Subunit: 229 residues, 2 copies
């Protein structure tokens, strides 16, 4: 079947991204990392979290412009740049500077695609969380004791040559649950921004609640939940 | 259903159409021309060639494992690494094998089951010297003057490793070969033969399907 072969070609691209993303649930030093990406097979949403010298933990949720194959190639680039930077530190950092490097790579006529991502670096020893948002995507929702709210911040998404990126630091309670979301919200533009903050609270902050969803979605949907308690 | 996926597949095709240089493009007497014929829209075969301080020129022909979307992702990766390294290098410069190694380190460990097969070459315009470095088992480049092969990476190993005539025409080829003939070893001694008796230019490559494997060829000519 003609459709058969191209669908085989598409699932070869989906199968290839599954290996690229880390495993879940993955817990270290009390922090549990869990992600759920729901792709037309090839997604523009990609989440990645890696260990750094057992002292610093980094993670991000990125969504490339639109969806499908076109944007699926950019997620490949991001995973390369990130892991590469670590090795680039040599055998022998404000995240802002990372989103900047991510930015420079995109600008050089690289498919003319821009990615919106939320970057977060956590110091395990001093319970410090330094997050840097570069996109206009729905802010992160951290959860404490039955209540949740947005960690607000402004900006460029990496399509301008001048960074102008600003990142903020925040300390972590003994029991916390940060949640990162993609463009999809259905799971009034701004009356829909208040839903996630209230819905995430009232609902089980664990990924277990997020898994319950499994007719495709207009835009790719992907979430990352970091919790410790 | 199918029409939607077709429109998504065509998007990945148009993005790679601009990703590759224009043809034919000639500099200092050297004419670079390539012809990539995808089987399923998205191809694993990618060719690229760029200027380097107008003294040295780099070119390569890559074939990622298999074909389609899955392998199409790696080509974008190769395209980035190369143009980025030149921005990294700056003044000092410093070997096609050394770059074949930078590409090597990036792919392994960050990727599973998608190794690259490449024919690397850097030519010094000033002294008429071409430095070739092959890392894949793909069909050797076919020299043109009578033709002939040139003597010559998923593993952690890094074992990756000439004067040129006044008139010459080197040609790189993919793993795919259609000879419309009845005749592996005999099909490897034929390219050198068919390439000679046939017009060395892309002109002939332009005239002449689908799978099993994607087909792409790079032709560097000088006369
Ligand atoms: Mg999107």
């Amino acid at each position: 079947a003609s459709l058969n072969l191209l669908q085989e070609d598409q699932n070869a691209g989906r199968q290839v991204q599954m290996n690229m993303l880390p495993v879940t649930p993955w817990s270290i030093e009390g922090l549990e990392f869990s992600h759920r990406i729901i792709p037309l097979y090839l997604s523009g949403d990609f989440v990645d979290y890696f260990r750094v010298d057992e002292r610093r933990v980094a993670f991000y949720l990125a969504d490339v412009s639109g969806h499908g194959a076109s944007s699926a190639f950019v997620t490949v680039l991001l995973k390369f740049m990130t892991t590469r930077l670590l090795y680039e530190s040599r055998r022998n950092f404000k995240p802002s500077e990372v989103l900047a490097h991510i930015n420079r790579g995109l600008i050089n006529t690289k498919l003319g695609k821009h990615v919106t991502m939320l970057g977060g670096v956590i110091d395990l020893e001093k319970n410090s969380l330094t997050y840097s948002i570069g996109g206009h995507l729905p802010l992160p929702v951290l959860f404490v004791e039955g209540q949740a709210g947005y960690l607000e911040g402004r900006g460029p998404v990496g399509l301008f040559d001048d960074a102008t990126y600003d990142d903020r630091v925040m300390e972590l309670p003994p029991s916390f649950s940060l949640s990162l979301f993609s463009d999809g919200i259905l799971d009034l533009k701004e009356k829909e921004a208040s839903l996630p903050e209230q819905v995430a609270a009232a609902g089980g902050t664990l990924d277990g609640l997020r898994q319950v969803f499994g007719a495709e979605m207009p835009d790719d949907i992907a979430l990352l939940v970091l919790s410790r308690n």
